[PDB]
Amino acid sequence: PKLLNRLNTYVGSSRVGKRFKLAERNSTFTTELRAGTATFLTMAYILAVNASILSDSGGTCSVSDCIPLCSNPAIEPSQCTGPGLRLIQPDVSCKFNPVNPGYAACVEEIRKDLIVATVAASLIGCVIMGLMANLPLALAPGMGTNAYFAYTVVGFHGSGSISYRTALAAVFIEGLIFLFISAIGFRAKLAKLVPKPVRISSSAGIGLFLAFIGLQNNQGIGLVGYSPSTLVTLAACPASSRISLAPVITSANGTVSLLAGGSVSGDIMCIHGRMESPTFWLGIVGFVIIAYCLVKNVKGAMIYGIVFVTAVSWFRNTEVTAFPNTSAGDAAHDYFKKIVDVHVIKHTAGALSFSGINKGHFWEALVTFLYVDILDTTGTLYSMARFAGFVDEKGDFAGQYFAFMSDASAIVIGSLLGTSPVTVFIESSTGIREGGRTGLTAITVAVYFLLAMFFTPLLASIPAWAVGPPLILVGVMMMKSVTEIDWEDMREAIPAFVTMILMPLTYSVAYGLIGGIGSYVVLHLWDWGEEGLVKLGFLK
Amino acid sequence: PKLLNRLNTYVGSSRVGKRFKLAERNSTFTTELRAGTATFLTMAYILAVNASILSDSGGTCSVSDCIPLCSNPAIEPSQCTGPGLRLIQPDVSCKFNPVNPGYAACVEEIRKDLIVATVAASLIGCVIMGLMANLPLALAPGMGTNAYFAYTVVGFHGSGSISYRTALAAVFIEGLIFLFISAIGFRAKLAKLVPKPVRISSSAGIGLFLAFIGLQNNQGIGLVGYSPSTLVTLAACPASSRISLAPVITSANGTVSLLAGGSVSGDIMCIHGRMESPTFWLGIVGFVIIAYCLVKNVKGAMIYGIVFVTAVSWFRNTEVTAFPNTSAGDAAHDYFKKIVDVHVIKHTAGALSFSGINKGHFWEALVTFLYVDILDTTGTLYSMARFAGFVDEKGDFAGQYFAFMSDASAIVIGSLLGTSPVTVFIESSTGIREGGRTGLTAITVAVYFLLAMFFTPLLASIPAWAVGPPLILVGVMMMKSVTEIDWEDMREAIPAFVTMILMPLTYSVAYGLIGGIGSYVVLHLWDWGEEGLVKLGFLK
Numbered sequence A, B: 001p002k003l004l005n006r007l008n009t010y011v012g013s014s015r016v017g018k019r020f021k022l023a024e025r026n027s028t029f030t031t032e033l034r035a036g037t038a039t040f041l042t043m044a045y046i047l048a049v050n051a052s053i054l055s056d057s058g059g060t061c062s063v064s065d066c067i068p069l070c071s072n073p074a075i076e077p078s079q080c081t082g083p084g085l086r087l088i089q090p091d092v093s094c095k096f097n098p099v100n101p102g103y104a105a106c107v108e109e110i111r112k113d114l115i116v117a118t119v120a121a122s123l124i125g126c127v128i129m130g131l132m133a134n135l136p137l138a139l140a141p142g143m144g145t146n147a148y149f150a151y152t153v154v155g156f157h158g159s160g161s162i163s164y165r166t167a168l169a170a171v172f173i174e175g176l177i178f179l180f181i182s183a184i185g186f187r188a189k190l191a192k193l194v195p196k197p198v199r200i201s202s203s204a205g206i207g208l209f210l211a212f213i214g215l216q217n218n219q220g221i222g223l224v225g226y227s228p229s230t231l232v233t234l235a236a237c238p239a240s241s242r243i244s245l246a247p248v249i250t251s252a253n254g255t256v257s258l259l260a261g262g263s264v265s266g267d268i269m270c271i272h273g274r275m276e277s278p279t280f281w282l283g284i285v286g287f288v289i290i291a292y293c294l295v296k297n298v299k300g301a302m303i304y305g306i307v308f309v310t311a312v313s314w315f316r317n318t319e320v321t322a323f324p325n326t327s328a329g330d331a332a333h334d335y336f337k338k339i340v341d342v343h344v345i346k347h348t349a350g351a352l353s354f355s356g357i358n359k360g361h362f363w364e365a366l367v368t369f370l371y372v373d374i375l376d377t378t379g380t381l382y383s384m385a386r387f388a389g390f391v392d393e394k395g396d397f398a399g400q401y402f403a404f405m406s407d408a409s410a411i412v413i414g415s416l417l418g419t420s421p422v423t424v425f426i427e428s429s430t431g432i433r434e435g436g437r438t439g440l441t442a443i444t445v446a447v448y449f450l451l452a453m454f455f456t457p458l459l460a461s462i463p464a465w466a467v468g469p470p471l472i473l474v475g476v477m478m479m480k481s482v483t484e485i486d487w488e489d490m491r492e493a494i495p496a497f498v499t500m501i502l503m504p505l506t507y508s509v510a511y512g513l514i515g516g517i518g519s520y521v522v523l524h525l526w527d528w529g530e531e532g533l534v535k536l537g538f539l540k
Ligand SMILES: *[C@@H]1O[C@H](CO)[C@@H](O[C@@H]2O[C@H](CO)[C@@H](O)[C@H](O)[C@H]2NC(C)=O)[C@H](O)[C@H]1NC(C)=O
Pocket: A070, A071, A072, A073, A088, B251, B253, B254, B255
């Protein structure tokens, strides 16, 4: 026959091959390898996106690592001794514009830690799913929860109500709760507890939220900046033509003065040169590349676009460079020079903190994580089971129990490594479409994630305009659920619309879910009350 | 028989009755009156919403009417004579926070003018449609174009690139162009020139834009405020707990100083007390009222909710009052005391200005108006023709030619009166569902609009939290078009997603359309090039 056929027949009839039920599922070794490769190509964008988004959270370090800064910018702090010269002690404002150099350095170290954490969590989840559940599903930090954890639960550079360690503890406890409810078969009841329009429209709302993030400045390609009158207008002006905003006090004559302690923003307001940012146009080029790759059914569309934009940004002395001519840029380029590096997690590994359990925001974030994971994992797992033809008449696909337990265990392990919840990727369908049927597909994806390590220097040098279009197009892909909402029935359209729109506007998944569920409950109060009276016999 | 039957038979067989073809359409006089009443009840919210939105544009008056203000707030300017005391001459900043009292007074006068202008334009459009076209369609300033004209073309208090008079000239010329192309049957070609996904998703994008406006502060109920890190978060804190933002200059040590000439914003940032604004909760109550009225198929849902919120706000010494204890509030309450007033347009009538024709923003706004009107009017007119069963096998419903000419003439007249383009309302379907078939329905709506005059004092005292939920629910109603987009085909999903999302985020209908069309063209360049090569014979 051939070497490939000999390998396939040897593996299929071996003890390892029969452990994965290769022969019973009509695929032995090379179909599984090809399916795993296709799935990894489809999901590889996460290696960059998850790390960047979680690094934007600020990590585990606080003002404690902000180096004191001299009164005058031109003198390095060690030389901050002289007449009328003093060292300014850092405060909370050191974490934001202008970011303290020490905090930025710690954020870069956290980005390396989170790259390794994403790779390790995805690897472990894939291995657990392949061995325990024996399904061709790949696990990794979900895109829906990455942004919620980074920009809402924790906030940009720790500006949220919950600290990064407390958010990790919330994710850990959420994974434990999910594992518990799945183990006792009580998950389906929680799934039903969520209103149908809200459940369906949460995906579209999260897609809009991710797209909005991809159109911010510190997150994506720009194109959406601050506006005094409208709060959002056309950004994409060059970084030099952007200024920060500070709170002020108005009066009845026209005087305006700064407010002490005000939280100054990033360079989000454009003063001139709109639609002239070279980084924005490079991001648009990457968007076009990914869009054509998706249209042409090319596996790895997002990774190809990210690679193009990042490689164009790897040049040192351009306006779209990822390594500006500064100390931080010099350090980033020095780390990037080493193509391969075995980075060890030093900050985000085992950074759980249960101080904020009593806080209400902790439980808001915990419940949002729990329900996003429940709904997403249920829908994705059953859709992949349908794709692979494992769903029987009753709706059970054999390894569903262990699939959900594996997902929950992966969430807990990811929390222990310092990353947002890890879920089963819909990109796994690609591997299913290529013939993957057993757990060897997940093991292949895990091996590719192993290979993803030793490349943190390349993965840590991906700019915002590279993250960018991947986020916008992920938001595009998640909008297809709007067709499942009955927009003629207002009792279902209003909750769905609220769920979709509050998520980007309030910029929070939890607020979108709360508003949608509240509107659904309010709009059905009349129907529920009438039905209760009827069931009691008052009405006919 | 009965008095009603005698009236119906008398009118149906009279010359006036046969002029409207009553007998040939199976409805004589009371069916038309009932249909007109139902249509007016459905569309009455415009009387408030259009006037408020266009008043937010700032009107025809500039810094020229800003009264000079004394150095100290406690001394009225006439007494601004003394040691170290001077009168500050107004500048452009007088138009924004803190708004100069003179400019605010002129804006209130403009609001009265625009209430009368909306009523008059709707009346004239309805009369023209009823007489010339003989259809049961009601015309009024369209909701899609109100916000674009007020907040994008002209900007809040004239902060946009085009002045209010120049925008009126743009609307006038756009109406003339629409009339010209309709007269020569060339409108359908322009309609086809717009890509299908962009055409379908523009409605949903405008709905999202209107909903976002309804969640702003100076426009709706709040619930969306400024955030330094995310640019949007949860508002609805009390007005006392909101502060303005000003541009500043950052450095490498941490000093931040004000930027001279910076455009200070309104009180958009919440410092504390989130979700505690009584006005926001009153707006939420109005939202619930309108939502139940829509669910229960109650005609006039939005007008009922607006009336409830406005009446609750008409009390003088509450936290949700429309007449705060100030000079402006006192004047507003004094005008409101007179229930009936015959206001005469003094500023916005005949305020056309053709200075900005050469500007590119003038033509951007003109083309956006033209295409929004073309697509909206085509879709709405043909949908109403289908509702009334006037569409034959070929797709012609007799009076379509004169219907489009009437719409264009109404647009021109509305521009002459100082209001955004006037279109045929989808609410006309209500009158069609009640039996209205002839032009007498439009005349009845016009008579109800006559009655709408003599009530400017009541219509001019409608707060933002009353406009509010009407805008959010209008945005809800316009989302049903998303089901007409194929979200599995990326060549159609990406342009549709861009069109939907750029409109609220860039906060502009023109930018949304431009981005959607550009993405559609880019994504189809490969297909078009391949097809061109094939048609030339290079490929097979
Ligand atoms: C941080 O450095 C800036 C200089 O870049 C200091 O600016 C001071 O404030 C204004 C701006 O020039 C002037 O009135 C002062 O003369 C500036 N002084 C100096 C030495 O530049 C700013 O004061 C510094 N911040 C602190 C806390 O010392």
